[PDB]
Design an enzyme around this catalytic site. Structure first.
Site, PDB file in Angstrom:
ATOM      1  N   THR A 132       0.835  -1.204   0.000  1.00 34.84           N
ATOM      2  CA  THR A 132       0.000   0.000   0.000  1.00 34.84           C
ATOM      3  C   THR A 132       0.870   1.254   0.000  1.00 34.84           C
ATOM      4  O   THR A 132       2.055   1.194   0.321  1.00 34.84           O
ATOM      5  CB  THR A 132      -0.945   0.057   1.222  1.00 34.84           C
ATOM      6  OG1 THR A 132      -0.179   0.186   2.426  1.00 34.84           O
ATOM      7  CG2 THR A 132      -1.826  -1.191   1.303  1.00 34.84           C
ATOM      8  N   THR A 133       0.274   2.389  -0.352  1.00 34.59           N
ATOM      9  CA  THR A 133       1.017   3.643  -0.457  1.00 34.59           C
ATOM     10  C   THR A 133       1.275   4.255   0.924  1.00 34.59           C
ATOM     11  O   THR A 133       0.371   4.330   1.758  1.00 34.59           O
ATOM     12  CB  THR A 133       0.275   4.664  -1.348  1.00 34.59           C
ATOM     13  OG1 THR A 133      -0.125   4.035  -2.572  1.00 34.59           O
ATOM     14  CG2 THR A 133       1.169   5.859  -1.668  1.00 34.59           C
TER      15      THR A 133
END
Lengths: 231, 235, 111, 243, 241, 195, 244, 250, 240
Positions: free
Chosen positions: D30-31
């Site tokens: 995920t970012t």
């Protein structure tokens, strides 16, 4: 393929196959369900027998008066990890006079599993765990994967055909979270949840295993005629 | 090559699965649990007539209240028996009591997955552990090299196991006497053995609350074999 | 020179009846001529219908009781919640005490 | 060939392929981002809501080291936890011997050397995480980003995970449009926006926003999580910008 | 073909892992240069900050090992910092044990010996770096000693490292063929830095701004790096004649 | 324990050792044999601290018996005595030394000669025509210095030994409850059952 | 991890042979021939140096014959460096025995000890075996003059006459033909040199290509003397026996 | 971590060859030529200083090394392997001899210790053999002057004269024609310079040639006076000027 | 330390290193054991490919473990020395602690245990040796004969053979050995043992070794001439 010989090797797409194979052992295991309200937390587990002469393999293990788990996968690996949890719960009580937080127990299990995924010679754990408990911040339910990933949830299920129970809990979310001060109804919801994962077989008196922990309820396991009330 | 602790794509440990194949090549062992006791029986399977068959020891005492039968690579069982005997005696030293049959079985099964690169490989032998304690009465367990153990009303291991287990499925009921169990083990051993069953190539044993673990004399077993022959000819 | 031992006083008494048993003790804790506490519990419920007191040097006394309570907990874990009988508890305490044979718990224990 | 089957082996290029494969696990995560502001740093991360059954605000991802350093990472979460545990040991031993809390550049090298050590032998696997971390010390604010190879540099802004390209472009605009600098409260708002914008690469499932910060004026140089009204204000600012 | 994976001999008597470590050395695409003056030793290196999100002050391949010794590295930054930390630890230990500052050539030998071990022991990989150590030694004067992944080391009048090392090396060779002396005959270090930058410009055929370079200077009893504004002053002087 | 004596005559070695074992206040036994056969033609008597004496003697016995089986050969008395000396010399600088003094009487079948070795707990070895440990020598050596001849028979050796024991029984304060006497010659080891 | 690069030096083949032992024996078959002959009044050791040079300093050179103590010597066939490791161990073992028992070590006990060390490298440790075969010539007062051989497997055997190294098949046949039990040292010296002269791969057998040694009770009265022959002394015995 | 390579990396092949040792000898063959010649009153060892770059100061790279005051060494093959072997050889001369007997080891025994170290890198776990051949020259009271060659296997041999590396085959033939047992040290130096010229392509002078002798005691190099029995080292490295003087009488 | 798992399971449930150790036993010279009514005889084959051997000093095939127990073997000679040394040490240790010599069964159980251990320990290979262990328990007149193999299994035998061509001599023993009436004397037992080896040996010269063990530590090895007399009498009865 060429990258699944040991846990110390990434694949070209960045995967760890030995860990993924360990995850596969959980999917072969028997179904077990976990769910909680604001006052109680419940485990329901379908036990598996070898044949008609054999006993049904136990699925639920007590870790402390306020904490315990259910297993799916390699049972000896659950014994190793539950023994570690028993020791950690115990260290907290003896040294700090403090009941071990369920969230902190999840962090410790994550770190223990991680070491077996980055070193040569070892192997990942081949079991998934559902940890319930009641501590200073109320009821809790955790899901452990042998990749190291630990997640806090309202409800979940692991093992073969666990997707049916997981969808049911996703529908019933708003109902079962509100079942406060009524242990029997919360177990009913858990027994109804695990029923969405059954095929050909049904819940009998030596098939079903239930555990509960709550506000004024020590972690206790129900087997035999003690679960006939819920069949 | 490949790790000794490697998982297969199906989520099984290669070495554990391969050791299970060695156990399938082993001589047959059968156990039956009743409310009057648990019976243990084995096929001796001597490789030559010059081999003195009473030196074949595949049924072994762990304590007065716990016996054990083996199938597979029987040399591997010796350290498992040693550990079991030590665990039983040590618990009596620490707690002034008999150890529970389940607890003894669990202690033996803790050795199983202690292999890697500890011992270099899993055990190539399966055990039937039978005994009695005050809390759970007469019990029979099946200890595997996977570390898993199941409790059984009746169980067969070794080369004739699936044929024997089907036979045990039909014959076992909760009202069996000790005498009925003895004849039943002899009957099923006779069914799956290559050679003709007699007192020299097969061995019986039992565990009762009163007398404890006992390996049967060849003379005692010979009488039970004669009793079996007559009752099968009776219809 | 450092003295690892001390004396916290106190007196305890155990009597066995026909179908009952009592374990009594005073609540006073002391060093030399001073009172540390007028109410410091010395007899403890250890679970499984067993009561215990380890009188003498209170640090060693608290340590021993704590380790025995822990032994009861692990006896349940290891042996399917079996009740620890009084004779089994007694033999277990012998091993806890003899484990420090050459640096003893300076206490007189009664269960 | 066969140079990519074992860690620490140089290929004929002079590359360590196992380290490059660890980067693939990072790119799959995920970012997560970091923004360096006038007197501190802000960290933010995207948390994918896999199911309704996940308890909101409970599965906390950002981690504190000592009391002045924040750490966030993308990739294999357990690997990140292992690295933070080591970082906490390094910070404790530094403070034990030298009294003062570990400076951020000093802390950066401790993580760097440890991650680099896992590229020296075939008996260990490289870390499957890129870690964004930083805080305030005696010389001011510092932001760092550390890769699986052990490589790290100081940053004005940093991003990693599946939506890193989108995030980087947004960070570059902030650097250009604010040469004088960004305030801590502005950075929290901007961090919320960038995560929301970066969520387009993960648009299938909805997500939960998590922000933390260390600021000399706003948090007294201690690491704190953004909660309640200040978090909602940042969520509102972010939702307004995407519409 | 496992003789290519670990540091054992190939049938030709070669160590391929060592050779491939030499190739990793040029992964950063950076060129460095070192020269000696009368009283000083100067080292310059290219500085490239390709990302705008980077803090340019933290991007560096020059290290202050001790008060007297500086080190520039050609190779990836993780291996560079590994070597830097070890060199700093070795220099400090030397001073504690033997009561005087570790000489530049002695530190080079020590790091070279450590590198040799990685070429002989299988479990350890070579570091993909070339290390150029500089100082003004109290006995030998201005000193340049360079180490590589084979465990080789030697002193230099001047030296160059990187993808375009040959162009710089030949340029330096031609100058010393004219002057017929082993150093830059100049009093101040400022002019020796100007010589170093000028001859790198000539050899590479590129111009430099203040942010395109990185400079380290060794004098008697201290090694230091120049700021961007110190380098700017150097560039201005070069352009004005 | 207490008194151990040895005498090497023409064709044999004779060892005499007291029978008493005393636990401080009481004499617990009056028939104790303070000797071990190391090999068919080698005998070792011992005295020193309680427990350590028997532990050391049996340890030596086990080692010599092991050598005998491995090589199918009996070590010479000289070789056995050297092995024993080294063990005691090693022991004296240990954490807790063996407090044991020994006499080794053996008949060398190769040289056809009897041999008597005296070794104390420090590892001090001497070959002697006659020897003792403790206070035994203080009472007996003046008699042995007078009467001893290298060409004595076994019977003459026993008679000279009787005179030594009689002097011990007269002038020693402790009651050592007599001695067990054993002879080592070409035919092996035997016990004199009337002394 | 590391398993990938492991040759597994201590495993059986499907036929029940030890790979590395067999291959080490193949190495030894290319080494210079060494011969031992036992007589009633002594033992002879003769050995061929491998293709030498005129610039090799022979009088200070030793590659074949080594002294273990005053009573025992060895002839080497195989890797010289491997042999010196084992030789030094054997010298220490002999001194350990002498210190313990105050008697010189019996020949077989020394041979068994070295052979057990060789055996260990074939069963555990994952290391390559020693590429060495020994001929042991020695004397003790139990068995008198004795000849033994040991090889990389750690197996050892006793001999009246034996060869190791190159052309052992041809050498052993020649020894089996001319050896007799009542033979004397001077006769055994001649047999050893004649056998080497016929089995050698060189054009002719000269003094500079040989190492020679005798163990004789030809020491003044009941004692034993070791004689490592000098270059000039090897030249003389070659003329005496009529080979040059 | 931990070194998990506890197994041999050098093993016997079906033909009885130890591959890694053979390959190490191949590396030595590629190395620059070095030689040694023994005279009646001394020994000479020599090699070419093959400078990797003209900017490199080749005086800072010592191919000929003092091991003890009376023993020197030169090599052919991998330079770094040689450098660490010199360090180990210098130390073992002290730890296993001088700290025991109070004197420096004789040539043959120091050679024996170096050989042992090289043998162990051929059998021990997780290591490769050293890729060098050494020529060790020395003097001691009871053995006189001597010259030894040590190979990667650990084997060592004494020589009157020899050569190793690149052009060793041709150099050894040249030495066979010129060597006799009546050579004085100056004659041996002359022959050494003649032999070495054949294998050198470029410049041939005192700056490109490294040469050392084991000869007479040098009291001028001792560093102190007052002890009659201490007369100074027999090892001496010839200067650039001293080599050039003998190249005019060439 | 070297920890590599050399003995492991294969897909069909076999441990090949243990099975290949048995192939080394198959290659070894033949060994045979026969127990009579009041004795046990151990016979061993000597391959005559090696002459010019010194038989005085060459390691003999039968080894005394104690004064009352002997051990013979087939397989790797060097491997057998390690088992013999361990057994001898254990025999003396047993006497030291129990104050009684080992029973034949106990000594067998120990040696078999050592062999098993080397089949599931890291970094080691199995022993390429099978053994025949014979003797009499202390103060007992009942003959004892046991066999061990590389896997570590052991058992008691009325008569048994191991090594090369042991299939042939076992065939002979199975039809010639009667359990109801074992060889009543030393003569009869030695005769049956020499007969069994003559099925396989070649020349009855220096190729057959015979060792007789009787109760109360009475062990003796027969000489060439004594064995030669058995060889002579057997073939003269065969010419009929």
């Amino acid at each position: 393929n060429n990258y699944d010989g040991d846990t110390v090797t990434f694949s070209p797409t960045g995967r760890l196959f030995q860990v993924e194979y360990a995850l596969e052992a959980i999917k072969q295991g028997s179904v077990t369900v976990g769910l909680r309200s604001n006052t109680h937390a419940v485990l329901v587990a379908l036990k598996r027998n070898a044949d008609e002469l054999s006993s049904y393999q136990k699925k639920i293990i007590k870790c402390d008066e306020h904490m315990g788990l259910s297993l799916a996968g390699l049972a000896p690996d659950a014994r190793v990890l539950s023994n570690y949890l028993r020791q950690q719960c115990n260290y907290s009580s003896l040294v700090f006079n403090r009941k071990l937080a369920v969230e902190r127990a999840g962090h410790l299990l994550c770190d223990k599993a991680q070491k077996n995924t980055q070193s040569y010679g070892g192997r990942p754990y081949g079991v998934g765990l559902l940890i319930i408990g009641y501590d200073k911040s109320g009821a809790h339910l955790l899901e452990f994967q042998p990749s190291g990933n630990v997640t806090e949830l309202y409800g979940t299920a692991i093992g073969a055909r666990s997707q049916g129970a997981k969808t049911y809990l996703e529908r019933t979310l708003d109902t079962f979270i509100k079942i406060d001060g009524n242990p029997d109804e919360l177990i009913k919801a858990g027994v109804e949840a695990i029923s969405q994962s059954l095929r050909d077989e049904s819940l009998t008196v030596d098939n079903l295993s239930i555990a509960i922990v709550g506000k004024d309820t020590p972690f206790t396991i129900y087997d035999g005629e003690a679960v006939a009330k819920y069949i | 090559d490949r790790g000794v602790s490697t998982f297969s794509p199906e989520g099984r440990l290669f070495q554990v699965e391969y050791s299970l194949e060695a156990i399938k090549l082993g001589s047959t062992a059968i156990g039956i649990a009743t409310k009057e006791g648990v019976v243990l029986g084995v096929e001796k399977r001597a490789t030559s007539p010059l081999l003195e068959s009473d030196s074949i020891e595949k049924i072994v005492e762990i304590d007065r209240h716990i016996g054990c039968a083996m199938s597979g690579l029987t040399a591997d069982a010796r350290s498992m028996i040693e550990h079991a005997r030590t665990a039983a005696v040590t618990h009596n030293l620490y707690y002034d009591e008999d150890i529970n049959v389940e607890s003894l079985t669990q202690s033996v099964c803790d050795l199983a997955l202690r292999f890697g690169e500890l011992m270099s490989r899993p055990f190539g032998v399966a055990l039937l552990i039978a005994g009695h304690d005050a809390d759970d009465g007469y019990q029979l367990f099946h200890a595997e090299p996977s570390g898993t153990f199941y409790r059984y009303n009746a169980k067969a291991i070794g080369s004739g196991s699936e044929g024997a287990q089907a036979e045990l499925l039909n014959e076992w009921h909760s009202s069996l006497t000790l005498k009925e169990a003895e004849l039943l083990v002899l009957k099923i051993l006779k069914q799956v053995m290559e050679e003709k069953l007699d007192e020299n190539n097969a061995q019986l044993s039992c565990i009762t609350k009163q007398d404890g673990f006992k390996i049967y004399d060849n003379e005692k077993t010979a009488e039970l074999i004669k009793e079996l022959k007559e009752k099968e000819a009776a219809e | 020179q450092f003295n690892p031992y001390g004396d916290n006083g106190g007196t305890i008494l155990g009597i066995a009846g026909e179908d009952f048993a009592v374990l009594a003790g005073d609540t006073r804790n002391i060093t030399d001529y001073s009172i540390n506490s007028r109410y410091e519990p010395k007899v403890f419920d250890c679970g499984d219908n067993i009561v215990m007191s380890a009188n003498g040097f209170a640090a060693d006394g608290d340590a021993l009781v704590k380790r025995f309570k822990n032994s009861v907990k692990w006896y349940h874990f290891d042996h399917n919640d079996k009740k620890l009988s009084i004779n089994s508890a007694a033999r277990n305490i012998q091993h806890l005490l003899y484990g420090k044979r050459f640096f003893p718990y300076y206490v007189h224990t009664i269960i | 060939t066969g140079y990519d089957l074992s860690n620490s082996v140089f290929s004929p290029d002079g590359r360590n392929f196992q380290v490059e494969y660890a980067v693939k696990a990072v790119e799959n995560g995920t970012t997560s981002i970091g923004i360096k502001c006038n007197d501190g740093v802000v960290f933010a991360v995207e948390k994918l809501i896999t199911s309704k059954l996940l308890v909101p605000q409970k599965n906390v991802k950002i981690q504190v080291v000592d009391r002045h350093i924040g750490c966030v990472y993308s990739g294999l979460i357990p690997d990140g936890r292992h690295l933070v545990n080591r970082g906490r040991e390094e910070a404790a031993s530094f403070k034990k011997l030298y009294k003062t809390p570990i400076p951020i550049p000093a802390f950066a090298d401790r993580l760097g050397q440890y991650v680099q050590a896992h590229t020296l032998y075939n008996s260990v696997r490289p870390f499957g995480v890129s870690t964004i971390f930083g805080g305030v010390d005696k010389n001011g604010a510092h932001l760092y980003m550390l890769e699986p190879s052990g490589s790290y540099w100081g940053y004005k802004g940093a991003a990693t995970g599946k939506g890193r390209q989108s995030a980087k472009a947004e960070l570059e605009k902030l650097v250009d449009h604010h040469p004088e600098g960004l305030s801590a409260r502005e950075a929290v708002k901007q961090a919320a926006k960038i995560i929301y914008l970066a969520h387009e690469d993960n648009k299938e499932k909805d997500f939960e926003l998590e922000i933390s910060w260390c600021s000399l004026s706003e948090t007294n140089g201690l690491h704190k999580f953004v909660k309640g009204d200040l978090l909602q204000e940042a969520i509102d600012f972010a939702q307004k910008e995407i519409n | 073909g496992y003789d290519r994976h670990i540091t054992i001999f190939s049938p030709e008597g070669r160590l391929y892992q060592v050779e491939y470590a030499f190739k990793a050395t040029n992964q950063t695409n950076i060129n460095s240069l070192a020269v000696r003056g009368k009283d000083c030793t100067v080292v310059i290196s290219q500085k490239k900050v390709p990302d705008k999100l980077l803090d340019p002050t933290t991007v560096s391949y020059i290290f202050c090992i001790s008060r007297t010794i500086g080190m520039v590295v050609n190779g990836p930054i993780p291996d560079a910092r590994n070597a830097a930390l070890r060199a700093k630890a070795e220099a400090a230990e030397f001073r504690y044990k033997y009561g005087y500052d570790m000489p530049c050539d002695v530190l080079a030998k020590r790091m070279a010996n450590l590198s040799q071990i990685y070429t002989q022991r299988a479990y350890m990989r070579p570091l993909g770096v070339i290390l150029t150590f500089v100082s003004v030694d109290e006995e030998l004067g201005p000193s340049i000693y360079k180490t590589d992944p084979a465990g080789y080391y030697v002193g230099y009048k001047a030296t160059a490292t990187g993808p375009k090392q040959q162009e710089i090396t030949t340029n330096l060779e031609n100058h010393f063929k004219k002057s017929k002396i082993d150093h830059i005959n100049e009093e101040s270090w400022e002019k020796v830095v100007e010589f170093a930058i000028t001859h790198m410009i000539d050899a590479l055929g590129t111009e430099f701004s203040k942010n395109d370079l990185e400079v380290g200077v060794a004098t008697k009893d201290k090694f230091f790096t120049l700021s961007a504004e110190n380098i700017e002053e150097r560039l201005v002087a070069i352009a004005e004649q | 324990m207490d008194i151990i004596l040895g005498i090497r005559v023409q064709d044999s070695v004779i060892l005499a050792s007291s029978k008493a074992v005393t636990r401080g206040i009481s004499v617990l036994k009056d028939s104790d044999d303070k000797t071990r056969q190391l090999s068919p033609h080698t005998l070792m008597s011992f005295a020193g601290e309680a427990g350590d004496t028997v532990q050391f003697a049996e340890y030596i016995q086990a080692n010599i018996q092991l050598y005998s089986i491995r090589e199918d050969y009996e070590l010479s008395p000289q070789a056995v005595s050297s092995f024993v000396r080294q063990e005691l010399a090693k022991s004296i600088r240990s954490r807790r030394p063996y407090q044991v003094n020994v006499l080794i009487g053996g008949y060398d079948k190769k040289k056809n000669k009897p041999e008597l070795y005296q070794i104390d707990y420090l590892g001090t070895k001497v070959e002697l025509p006659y020897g003792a440990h403790g206070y035994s020598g203080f009472y007996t050596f003046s008699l042995l210095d007078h009467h001893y001849r290298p060409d004595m028979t076994t019977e003459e050796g026993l008679d000279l030994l009787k005179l030594c024991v009689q002097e011990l029984e007269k002038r020693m304060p402790m009651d050592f409850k007599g001695v067990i006497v054993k002879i080592v010659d070409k035919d092996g080891i035997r016990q004199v059952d009337d002394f | 991890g590391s398993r990938r690069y492991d040759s597994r030096t201590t495993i059986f083949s499907p036929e029940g042979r030890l790979y590395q032992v067999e291959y080490a024996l193949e190495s030894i078959s290319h080494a210079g021939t060494a011969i031992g002959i036992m007589a009633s009044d002594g033992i002879v050791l003769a050995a061929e140096r491998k293709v030498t040079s005129t610039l090799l300093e022979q009088d200070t050179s030793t590659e074949k014959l080594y002294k273990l103590n005053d009573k025992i010597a060895v002839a080497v066939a195989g890797l010289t460096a491997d042999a010196e490791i084992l030789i030094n161990t054997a010298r220490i073992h002999a001194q350990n025995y002498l210190k313990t028992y105050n008697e010189d070590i019996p020949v077989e006990i020394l041979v068994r000890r070295l052979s057990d060390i060789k055996q260990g490298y074939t069963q555990h440790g994952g290391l390559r075996p020693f590429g060495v075969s020994f001929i042991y010539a020695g004397y003790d007062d139990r068995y008198g003059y004795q000849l033994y051989t040991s090889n990389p497997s750690g197996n050892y055997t006793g001999w009246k006459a034996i060869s190791v190294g190159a052309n052992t098949s041809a050498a052993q046949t020649l020894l089996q033909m001319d050896y007799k039990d009542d033979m004397k040292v001077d006769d055994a010296i001649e047999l050893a040199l004649k056998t080497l002269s016929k089995t050698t791969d060189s054009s002719a057998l000269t003094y500079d290509r040989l190492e020679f040694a005798t163990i004789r009770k030809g020491a003044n009265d009941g004692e034993v003397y070791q004689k490592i022959f000098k270059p000039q002394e090897i030249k003389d015995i070659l003329v005496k026996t009529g080979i040059t | 971590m931990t070194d998990r390579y506890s197994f041999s990396l050098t093993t016997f092949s079906p033909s009885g060859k130890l591959g890694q040792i053979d390959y190490a000898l191949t590396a030595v063959k590629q190395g620059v030529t070095s030689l040694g010649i023994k005279a009646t009153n001394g020994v000479v060892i020599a090699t070419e200083k093959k400078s990797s770059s003209p900017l490199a100061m080749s005086e800072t790279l010592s191919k000929v090394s003092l091991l003890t005051p009376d023993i020197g060494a030169v090599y052919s093959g991998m330079g770094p392997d040689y450098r660490v072997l010199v360090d180990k050889s210098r130390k073992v001369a002290h730890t296993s001899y001088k700290r025991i007997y109070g004197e420096y080891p004789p040539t043959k025994l120091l050679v024996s210790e170096v050989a042992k170290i090289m043998q162990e890198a051929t059998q021990s776990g997780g290591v490769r053999p050293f890729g060098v051949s050494l020529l060790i020259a020395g003097h001691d009271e009871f053995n006189g002057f001597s010259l030894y060659q040590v190979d990667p296997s650990g084997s060592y041999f004494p020589w009157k004269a020899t050569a190793i590396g690149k052009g060793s085959v041709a150099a050894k033939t040249f030495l066979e024609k010129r060597w006799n047992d009546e050579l004085e040290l100056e004659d041996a130096i002359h022959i050494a310079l003649l032999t070495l010229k054949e294998s050198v392509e470029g410049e041939f002078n005192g700056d490109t040639i490294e040469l050392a002798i084991i000869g007479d005691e040098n009291p001028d190099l001792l560093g102190y006076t007052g002890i009659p029995t201490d007369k100074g080292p027999r090892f001496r490295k010839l200067t650039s000027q001293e080599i050039n003087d003998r190249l005019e009488a060439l | 330390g070297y920890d590599r798992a050399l003995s492991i399971f294969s897909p069909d449930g076999h441990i090949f290193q243990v099975e290949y150790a048995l192939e080394a036993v198959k290659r070894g010279t033949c060994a045979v054991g026969v127990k009579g009514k009041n004795c046990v005889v151990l016979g061993c084959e000597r391959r005559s490919t090696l002459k010019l051997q010194d038989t005085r000093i060459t390691p003999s095939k039968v080894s005394k473990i104690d004064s009352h127990v002997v051990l013979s073997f087939s397989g790797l000679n060097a491997d057998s020395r390690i088992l013999i040394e361990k057994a001898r040490v254990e025999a003396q240790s047993h006497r030291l602690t129990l104050e009684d010599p080992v029973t034949v069964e106990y000594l067998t159980r120990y040696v078999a245990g050592v062999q098993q251990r080397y089949t599931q320990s890291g970094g080691v290979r199995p022993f390429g040796v099978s053994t025949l262990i014979a003797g009499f328990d202390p103060r007992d007149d009942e003959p004892k004969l046991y066999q061990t193999e590389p896997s570590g299994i052991y058992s008691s035998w009325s008569a048994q053979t191991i090594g090369r061509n042991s299939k042939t001599v076992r065939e002979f023993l199975e039809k010639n050995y009667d359990r109801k009436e074992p060889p009543a004397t030393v003569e009869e037992c030695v005769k049956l043992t020499v007969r069994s080896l003559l099925e396989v040996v070649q020349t009855g010269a220096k190729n057959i070794e015979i060792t007789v063990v009787k109760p109360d530590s009475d062990i003796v090895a027969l000489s060439s001439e004594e064995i030669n007399q058995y060889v002579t009498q057997i073939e003269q009865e065969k010419q009929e």
